[PDB]
Structures are given as structure tokens and as C-alpha cells.
Amino acid sequence: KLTSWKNELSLQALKADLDAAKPSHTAMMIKVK
Amino acid sequence: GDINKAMFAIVSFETCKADLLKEKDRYHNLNKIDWQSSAPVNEPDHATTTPQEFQISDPMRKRVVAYEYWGFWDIEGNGVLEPIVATWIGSTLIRLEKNPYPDGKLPFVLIPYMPVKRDMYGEPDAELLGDNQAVLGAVMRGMIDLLGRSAN
Amino acid sequence: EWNDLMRIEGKAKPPKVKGRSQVQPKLVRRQAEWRYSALTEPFLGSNKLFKVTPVTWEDVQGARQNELVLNYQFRTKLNRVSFIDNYVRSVVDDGTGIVRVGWNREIRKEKQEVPVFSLFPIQTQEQADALQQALQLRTDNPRGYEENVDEAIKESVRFFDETGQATYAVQTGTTTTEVEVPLANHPTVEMLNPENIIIDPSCQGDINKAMFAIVSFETCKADLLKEKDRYHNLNKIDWQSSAPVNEPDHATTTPQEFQISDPMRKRVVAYEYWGFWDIEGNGVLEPIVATWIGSTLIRLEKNPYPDGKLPFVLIPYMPVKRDMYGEPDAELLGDNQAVLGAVMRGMIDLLGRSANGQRGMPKGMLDALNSRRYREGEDYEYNPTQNPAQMIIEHKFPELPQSALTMATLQNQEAESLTGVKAFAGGVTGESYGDVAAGIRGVLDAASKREMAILRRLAKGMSEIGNKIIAMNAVFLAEHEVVRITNEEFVTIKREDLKGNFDLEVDISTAEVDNQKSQDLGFMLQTIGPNVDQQITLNILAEIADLKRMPKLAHDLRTW
Amino acid sequence: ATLQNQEAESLTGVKAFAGGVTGESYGDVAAGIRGVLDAASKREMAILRRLAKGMSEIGNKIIAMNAVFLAEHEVVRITNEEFVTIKREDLKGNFDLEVDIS
Amino acid sequence: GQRGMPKGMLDALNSRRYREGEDYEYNPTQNPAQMIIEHKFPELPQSALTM
Amino acid sequence: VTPVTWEDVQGARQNELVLNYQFRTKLNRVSFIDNYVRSVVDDGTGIVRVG
Amino acid sequence: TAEVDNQKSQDLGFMLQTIGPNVDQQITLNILAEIADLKRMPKLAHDLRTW
Amino acid sequence: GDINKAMFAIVSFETCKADLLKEKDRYHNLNKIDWQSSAPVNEPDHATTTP
């Protein structure tokens, strides 16, 4: 436990958020390319 | 369509062990990191100009890809969201604390070239000019072929 | 249909043919493309967006205070450039723009040690002198009083304000107390998707006559928990049932498959009902607000805003008589765009389908060896019967007929005549918006006045937004916040006078207006004798200095 | 070829050897007052203002960070004048200052 | 955009070579420059514009 | 940097001096401006990271 | 209209120039009052009137 | 041809019960009215944009 917070984010939550947000960015990057 | 309304933002960058050791107190679990596993070549997702086969001999100066998470989280679980920052390399979380900057917002600024209504991003001028460029190229190719293929 | 015409989609797209082109020039996009930059510039030419002017002689302090507060709020809490761009683009593209005005407030409770002071009667002249200096510092400079006077003398001044008798306080101990620190207290202005908001159809063309208005937006649990007392029945809500994918009616750019892992931060669609209802059943209609998520009613109360009207503003691009909505320019230009695209496709097909670069050779002109010599690229000898100059044919592009160019020119001219927009002309109407600046003896071509009318239509909505925000600030903002922003004494507005906008007038401020006002002030100072009255001259000089953005000089001249 | 070039110039609004002088007229009192520019200049002016807004945001962020991180002696060395202190409570809301491109 | 070709000017192989887009050989009796016709838009009369 | 009120002149001058010194010394202004403008024009959107 | 106010201001200035400034102070103060009113300066006009 | 010389003028408008109840003294026999009988759809003569 890195911090003393009552509720800690943990790495799985961040990875899930990144995986969820990835599809829109991947589709968007095609236009820039 | 509003950057301020965004819940989170994630950015990936290249860093070395010396940069992390500059502020020893900020980062933890540096020993558990496996430097070879996290490399620019190992992660296709990261986009950089660094050559794939380039590698620095010195372990201290070797570059590894890292991720940061800037966003709002309910730290105490009572329904109150506050800004936080989290940094992880590979599968190890090295840094976790609150937002250090006084402003309390994500340190990102977006500027659109041609705004799109109710949208974050902008558009360049190539969208309107691609077809014209294609037609002009075709006409020029036709003229040059006409001149070149003739006998002189 | 208008958006499809703008973006070349739906019926606007040309049919797909294997051997022919599918190109279409963008006429409506181009006409709106100059219109955007023509309209946007007046609202961003100066650092100050809003101008507040007194109606009578007594209103100067209130006008200055409200102008300062409004300008600070718009400069700090909002991204002015993006808001202006979205506003103008929506008005031009859709023909009607709906603006939602609201208030955002969030307070956090904190515990801090607070010293305890025991009063003591004022003794000797030193205490009286210190108290007098503190009062003088508070009157002259609030910020210096807050920063330098210190807590004990501040308590003494507070007791002097409460009770006429002067007292001296000495610290005894520290006691923890609960203090509320508000993170955000600022109005919010947001453009609305036309599909989201539904207005009463029986309004008879007037927004004020509308009985009710319904708007749907995206919200999360944290936003509702920001104001716990406002909302009820939060536990009964099922978040999964009310989702953007679940409701096709709501129009949003959020991806269907995107869902935030944390339940607190997940977004759910909610509805609000702004209208008039007979609450007591005696035939008296009063404004109300009602919010429900899914099938659960969470909030029900009266209208909080002092104005008592629906917080929506509508601006039409091209008005329709006895109608609420407006019309864009695509209606007139769809046919011309279609004809121009057809002509261009015809020309491109004509050029593309022709054979180019091929060479034709008559039979028998050259035998095998001479034909080979010609093919490699060296000298040859031909039969005199056939002349290579004429018989050898090299194909070329066919000549374009004049009809296509003439019809394209006719369509372009008709489009420019109907719309009133030319490619590289016009757009300078914004420099002449100022009344005193350029309205007097200001001559502009016929094409400029239509843009002038559109600019006035936009400025009316901007003035309405400013008036609404001023009305909300009159109640929601506290005294200390306004004192901090303005560094001057506070002016109070009675609650009964809030319904009717007296003493104030809000209009868009431009650079040329300030210059013309400075010239008028200089002329007025020249006309009046400088030695007639020193106070009038000092006030005029301070007013001139303020328009030039030198506040220290103006303050020095005023208190001279 | 001429038709394609003209269509591209009309859509984009940029010509080969014309324009580009919008930046000299950005100053409000400098040239915004009684300043007349052709239709093509105002699009460039709008884009320039869009860039200047981001520059102002960057400057405000950097000022906010300097308000906390920089010490007194460093600022005294840079400015060679008496130090002015800003309270931490006022840091959240940008009062007393306005940043713009010079 | 339509193209009309006279009968008998090109045999099978030369016609295919012309259609694909390469060099060909034609019978000297008929001249492809005049015989091959590419249709175009008709010219607009001046009466319509005048009226 | 310009003052909003009459008391803000000293703070505005101090902040302007410090910001100008920092941007002149610690950064290559020309390269940053060129990259910023080029990216904004080419991609249509520019993201700046401040730290 | 805007030009009406400007022309009325010019006419008032012409009348003030034609009449001697020192013949009557009340007339001059009043004329200055309507001149200030047409320029949208209520405070200046009120100060001139009650002077 | 003169509006002032007109003897009478008749205008039809849409109203609700609340508007009539705003000033109770002016209007009488409000109970006898049937709202369903008098409707915009019922009267073709009245021209309005209401659905």
C-alpha cells in the first residue's frame, strides 16, 4: 500500500480505464495519419 | 467536448533511472522494476523517433517507457473527488500522491486549428484539398506523359 | 438535412459509378466558412467582453462593480475563444442557438484552530490610535487591512462594528471550529444540442410565452452529491438502467461502449422540467423545476433564479415571421451545389475517360526493320505513299466546351447573389459596430448591412446572457468575494428590485467604442472651462485614464 | 489546373504572394481601433487569437507554479527589488493579474 | 463521356490493345483522329442568356 | 502582464520580469514556437505538457 | 438615430459659440447639460445642472 | 379607406384560463364555458402554428 488513503485506486483500475479509452483514440488517430 | 470536464488523462513518455533518482522521495519500488522488459521496442503503442536497435550501454542512462495518470478519484470513499497523480512502469506502481500543482487542473492545453462545434479536436486544410491535389496531379501526369512518350 | 448538405452526406453524396467520378465541390461550406470569421472577430477584439453603463447619475459605482465582476468571471472561469467559436458556428450551421445558463457551487467543510480573544476596555491613547489607523487602513485599502492588520486588531474592529464602544482583545486559547471553504462559486454557460431541448410548440413564436421546456443532459453521482440537500431518492436509482446507450433519444458524442469502472464517476442521463404550474390549485401559476432519472423523481422545488424565467436563450440566424426558429443558407444553395457538382463531374469524366499518350500507326507505312528503328528512337525511311506527319496520331485531352464553364459561373453568381457573400470581399462590419464610434456618418456597402443585422442579433443574446449572469451574481455572490475582486466598497441591491432590471444596461464592448468615448470626453473637457471646477476636471481625467487601462493613474487622480 | 488551384485558394483562403500581415495589427490600441483589413486577414487573425489563448493559459500555469516553487532570494536576484508575497488561498482563483502576448 | 468507333477500322487484337491503353495499328483507309468521337456538352445559345 | 487594480502594479512587474527571464534563459523560444505552430497547422490540434 | 444626436450636439455647440459665454452663466450651464446628455454622461450633466 | 373611420374591428386570439383568472373582475360566466368545444382544431377560421 503506497498511500494511507482509505480507498486506493490500484493498478487494475487504471489499466481498465486505459483499455476502455483506447478504442476512441485508435479510431481518431487514423484521421491524423 | 470540454477539456475541463474530462475525468482523466494518460500520457506516456521515455525516462531513465537518473531522472527517477533525482527525486528519491517521490518514487518507490525502483528495485522491483525490470528495465529490459519495459523498452520502446517492446511496446508498439508508444510512438517515438528513437531507433529500435539503439541501446545505451550504461544501465543508469538507459531509457524506459513510463505512464502517468492525471485524474480525479474518490480517495476517502465518501463521494468527494480530488485530483491525483499515479505513475507506473510495466506492471509496477512506483508513484502515488495528490496533485502537486496549485491550480488543481490537468497540465494539458489543447488548441484547435479549425474548431468543430461541440467537439474537442480540430481539422486541418488537407480534408478540403485532397481531391483537388489528386486531380491536379493527374492532369500534370497526363501532360508529362504526353510530352515524354512522343518522338523528338 | 441542412447538416447533410453542409457535410456532403445522405442525399448530397453523388451516386457511385465504377467508371465515373464522385466529386462534389462544397459551396455551402465555403459560404459559411467566410461567415464564421466575419462574425467571430467583433467578440474577441478586446480584453473586456462586456460593457455596463449607468442609467442615471447614481448608478456609476454599481455599473463599475458589476462590469469588473462580470469581466473577471468571463476571463477566469470560461474559455472565451472556444465558447465564441462554438456559439457562432452553431448559430450559422443550425440557424438557431440555444444557450443554457446555470450556477455551480461546491463547499467543503474543514476544521482549523481559531484563537479565543477576551475583550478589555480601551486604555491610553495608543490603543485608540491603533484602532483609528486600522479603521483608516480598512477604508482606504481592504487588501492591506486583510494582510497586515493581524487577527486581534481585526477582532477589535469587528466588535467596534457590532458595538459602538471600543474594546481591546487579548488572546487566551485556541479552539477548533468548523469552517466551510467553497472551491467553486461561478456561473456556467453551455451551448445546447437542438435535439436535446424540447420547447412548448404552442408558444406562438415567443420563447417567453412558452409554458414549459425540457432538457436532457449527462450527469454523474458526484455532481448530484455535490448538493445533497437538493436531491432525494438517490438510493432507489439504478444506474445501469439509465445509460446513454439505453436511451436513443439523447444525442451525444460519447462512445456507446465506453463505461467508467468507478460507480461514482459513471455518467447517467437525466431530465429536467422548467415551467409554470399551479402548485396550490387556486389558478395561480408559478415557475418550478423538476428533475427525474429514469422513472424516479429526485428533485422538486421552485425556481431558484431571481429572474423567474426559463434559463434558455434563442438566437435565429435568419428570422421567420411569427416563428421561433431560424433558417440557414443551405436551403437556397442545395440546388446550386447539386448542379455545380454535376457539371464538375461531367468535365472530370470527359477528361478522364479519354485516351492520352497512345500512338496510332497506319499499316504498311514502315516495314519490319524501319518500324523497329522508329520504335527504338533512331532515323527511319518511309514509303512515300503515306505521310507520317498526318497519319501518325498522338492522342490528347479533348477540348472543354464553354457551356460547362458558363453554367458553373452562373450557379456561382446566383449563389453569391442569394447569400450575399463574396469570396475575398467584406467582413469589416465589426469595426463599425460601435454607435458613437462609426454609426455616426458611417457609410457601408449594401452587403455589409446584412452582416451588421446578424451581429446585432448575436449581441442581443449576449446581452441577455450578461443580464441573467448579473442577476444571479446579485444573489449568490457574497460581500467578501466582490470586495476581493474589486478592492472597493460593496454596493447592495434590494431583492424586490431584482425582478425588474433598473439602473443597468449591458452591451458588447469594442476597441473603437473606448477610443470614441475618450475623444468625446476630451471634447467635453475642452468645451468646459478647465478652471470652472476642479472636481469635474479630475473626474473627467480619471474616466479618460480608465479607458486607457491605467488604473493606478485613475485612482491617483480621483483621490487627489 | 487553374480551376483546381482557384477552388483550393477559395476553400483555404490563402494565396501565393498575398497576406500574412495580420500579426502586425494584433495590438488592440495599436491597430484594432479604426483598423481595416481584407476578408482573408480575419481568418488568420482568428487562428492567431486561438494560439494566443493557449499561450496565455501556459503563462498563467507557469506563473501559478512559480508562485509556490520559487523562493524569495531567487526572485530578489532576478528582479533586484523587494519581494511581494501572494497568499496560498488566492492561488486557486487568478486575481490581480492578466497575461497576454506582447 | 461516350466513345464511338467505326466498324472495321481495328481488328480484334488492335481493338483490345486500344481498349487496354497501349499502342495500336489501324487500317489506313479510316483516320482515327476524325472517326473516333468523344461526345461533349452542347453549346448554349445566346438567346437564353439574353432573355 | 498587466495589473487589474491599482495595487497590482508591483506584482505584475515582478511576475513579468521572472517569466520573461525564465523563457529567455531556460528555453529555446524559436524552436518551441516553430514546433508549436507547425504541429497545430499539420494535425489541427496541439497538446502542451507543463511541468 | 445616432446621427441626429451628433447633429444636435453640433447645433448646440454653434449656439454656444454664437452667444457670449459671459452674458449668462445659467444658459451656458444648461446648454452644457444637454450637450453632456447627448453624449451619454448622466453624472456630468447632473453635476453641471446643480452647480 | 380610413382606419379611423372604421366602425368595428374583430380579432381572434388564443388564451388560457389562467390569463382570464389574472383579472377576475373583468370576466364573467367562466364556469359556463366548455374548453373542449372551443379549440384551435375545432375552429378552421383561426390561423395558427400550433399543432
Swiss-Prot record, chain B:
Highest taxon listed in the record's lineage: Viruses
Subcellular localization: Virion
Complexes and interactors: Homododecamer.
Functional description taken from the UniProt entry: Forms the portal vertex of the capsid. This portal plays critical roles in head assembly, genome packaging, neck/tail attachment, and genome ejection. The portal protein multimerizes as a single ring-shaped homododecamer arranged around a central channel.
Protein name: Probable portal protein
Gene: 59
UniProtKB/Swiss-Prot annotation, chain C:
Coiled coil: none
Domain of life: Viruses
Cellular component terms per the entry's GO annotation: virion component
Record-level GO BP terms: symbiont genome ejection through host cell envelope, short tail mechanism
Entry keyword RNA-binding: no
Alphabetical keyword list: Late protein, Viral capsid assembly, Viral genome ejection through host cell envelope, Viral genome packaging, Viral penetration into host cytoplasm, Viral release from host cell, Viral short tail ejection system, Virion, Virus entry into host cell
Compartments where located: Virion
Keyword Protein biosynthesis set for record: no
Predominant subcellular localization, coarse grouping: virion
Primary role: Forms the portal vertex of the capsid. This portal plays critical roles in head assembly, genome packaging, neck/tail attachment, and genome ejection. The portal protein multimerizes as a single ring-shaped homododecamer arranged around a central channel.
Subunit structure: Homododecamer.
Protein name, as recorded: Probable portal protein
Species assigned in the record: Enterobacteria phage N4
Lineage start: Viruses, Duplodnaviria, Heunggongvirae, Uroviricota, Caudoviricetes
Portion of the full-length sequence here: 52 to 611 of 763
